[PDB]
């Protein structure tokens, strides 16, 4: 059995982009186990200890003007540069969602049922899903799974509507996403 | 608000002597550096035809991370990390239709340290054909995420489980899935 204690060290450089690359913030951070110890915030301009363990390092790294200067320009030489390098396949990546509608469990009419609107394989995550009953939007009884990131640059989400289907009713799932100009719609007739 | 985030994340773990170097875009992995083959591995093949990255730089960074971990361990007075067991969820990547190729996704989330053993089981027996997985993805709370995949052919005859082993768990965890 393995019970030996573990020691973890993490280093993260996070580039935050606002309004394209008009506004950029760089956040450099070191985490001992699960505790951030020291960081460099481009908005601050120098290293700052977060915990007592990072005191020595912030004082040390801040004493090297060379490091500070390089770090203060990383917002341009690093952040903006990488944004440009990957823009075409990341920032601009677009994959259309596949929309399917089906009732949860096959039950006879006039009985409570959960209508499932499955939206999958899309990218980016920004998406809007709405349910309509005979042309009118149903804002209540909507059970959403939320955004699910599949780990392969694809998302999925299941938005269910609580209903009591009655013959003649037409239920429509409407989906808006950056990959399509007009919203996608799939109808299910009771 | 905020439109995008790119993250260069790396770690080194003792005594396992495990390291990792990767780039992340809005929660998705752009690429990571294979420590054994010392090469850049793109999450999606096409990424490599649009950009490049010298794996060497990553290897040099890891050497420093290893050295910093040593220093910090002693400085913390050998304070070990507290294991945080993972949340595990199994889903298909699309609505399942009998006899239609699909993929089972084992989502392992919110855990640390970044060490797990995952195996797929079909009717109780390990399966390896076509399986793949991601490296450890970073989280804002500094815990990790990891995905395991299993291509399969849906049927009413088979049952699957994602078996996950982690030090934060008292016993191996099995997440079940079967056609309903």
């Amino acid at each position: 059995g393995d019970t030996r204690p573990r020691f973890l060290w993490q280093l993260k450089f996070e580039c935050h982009f606002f309004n394209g690359t008009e506004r950029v913030r760089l956040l450099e951070r070191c985490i001992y186990n699960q505790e951030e110890s020291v960081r460099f915030d481009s908005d601050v301009g120098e290293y700052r200890a977060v915990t007592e363990l990072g005191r020595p390092d912030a004082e040390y790294w801040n004493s090297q003007k060379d490091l500070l200067e390089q770090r203060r320009a990383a917002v341009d030489t690093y952040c903006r540069h990488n944004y440009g390098v990957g823009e075409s396949f990341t920032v601009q990546r677009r994959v259309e969602p596949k929309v399917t509608v089906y009732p949860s469990k096959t039950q006879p009419l006039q009985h409570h049922n959960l209508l499932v609107c499955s939206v999958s394989g899309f990218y980016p995550g920004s998406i809007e899903v709405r349910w309509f009953r005979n042309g009118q939007e149903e804002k209540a009884g909507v059970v959403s799974t939320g955004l699910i990131q599949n780990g392969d640059w694809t998302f999925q989400t299941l938005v269910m509507l609580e209903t009591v289907p009655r013959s003649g009713e037409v239920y429509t799932c409407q989906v808006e996403h950056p990959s399509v100009t007009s919203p996608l719609t799939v109808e299910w007739r009771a | 608000k905020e439109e995008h985030v790119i993250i260069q994340a790396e770690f080194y773990l003792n005594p396992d002597q495990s390291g990792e170097f990767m780039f992340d875009f809005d929660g998705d992995e752009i690429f990571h550096v294979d420590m054994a083959k010392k090469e850049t591995v793109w999450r999606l093949e096409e990424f490599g035809r649009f950009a490049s990255f010298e794996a060497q730089g990553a290897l040099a960074n890891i050497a420093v991370d290893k050295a910093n971990l040593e220093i910090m361990t002693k400085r913390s007075n050998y304070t070990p990390i507290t294991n945080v067991p993972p949340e595990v969820t199994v889903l298909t990547n699309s609505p399942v239709e009998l006899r239609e190729p699909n993929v089972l996704i084992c989502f392992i989330d919110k855990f640390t340290p970044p060490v797990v053993n995952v195996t797929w089981l079909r009717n109780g027996k390990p399966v390896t054909t076509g399986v793949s997985e991601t490296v450890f993805l970073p989280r804002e709370d500094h815990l990790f995420r990891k995905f395991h995949y299993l291509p399969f052919l849906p049927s009413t005859e088979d049952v699957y489980d994602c078996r996950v082993e982690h030090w934060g768990l008292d016993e191996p965890l099995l997440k079940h899935w079967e056609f309903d």
Partner: peptide, 13 residues
């Protein structure tokens, strides 16, 4: 185009 990486600095002694 190539990705640039930020180099890690060694901690205090």
């Amino acid at each position: 185009a190539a990705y640039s990486d930020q180099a890690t600095p060694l901690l205090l002694s």
